[PDB]
Amino acid sequence: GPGSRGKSTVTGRMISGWL
Amino acid sequence: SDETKFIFDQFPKARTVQVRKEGFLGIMVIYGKHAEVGSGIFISDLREGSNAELAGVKVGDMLLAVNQDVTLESNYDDATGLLKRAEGVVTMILLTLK
Numbered sequence: 001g002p003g004s005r006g007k008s009t010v011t012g013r014m015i016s017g018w019l
Numbered sequence: 020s021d022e023t024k025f026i027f028d029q030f031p032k033a034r035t036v037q038v039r040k041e042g043f044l045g046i047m048v049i050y051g052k053h054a055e056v057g058s059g060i061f062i063s064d065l066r067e068g069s070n071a072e073l074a075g076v077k078v079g080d081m082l083l084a085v086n087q088d089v090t091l092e093s094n095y096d097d098a099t100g101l102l103k104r105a106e107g108v109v110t111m112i113l114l115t116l117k
Contacts, residue, residue: 001042002041002043003074004042006043006045006066006067006068006069007067007068008064008066008067009064009065009066009067009070009072009078010063010064010065011064014050017030017046017047017065018042018043018044018045018047018069019045019046019047019048019099019103
């Protein structure tokens with residue numbers, strides 16, 4: 001499956017907690 | 020009845036997107052406020068390459084329904100709960116403010 005961490009379009013940071 | 024159809028009379032510029040959950044939709048939300056519409060649930064972040072991004076969801080959009088559940092009056096726990104529980108193609112009604 002795709003990783004839980006992905007790139008924020010707002011911050012450019014790699015974060016989790018995606019819905 | 021379509022329990023969400025009334026939304027397009029209250030917010031005639033709202034639109035419907037169909038986003039497939041594959042791991043995630045690709046969004047985060049907040050409970051926030053906008054000068055033109057008041058308090059409610061807004062898209063607060065968008066994941067690069069995600070299906071939500073591909074479908075044209077924008078940061079700042081107001082989230083008005085998830086499938087047949089109206090989110091106009093939802094709190095943060097209830098709206099995130101609806102988004103987390105939804106499977107497959109998730110229908111969202113969104114309003115871009117401009």
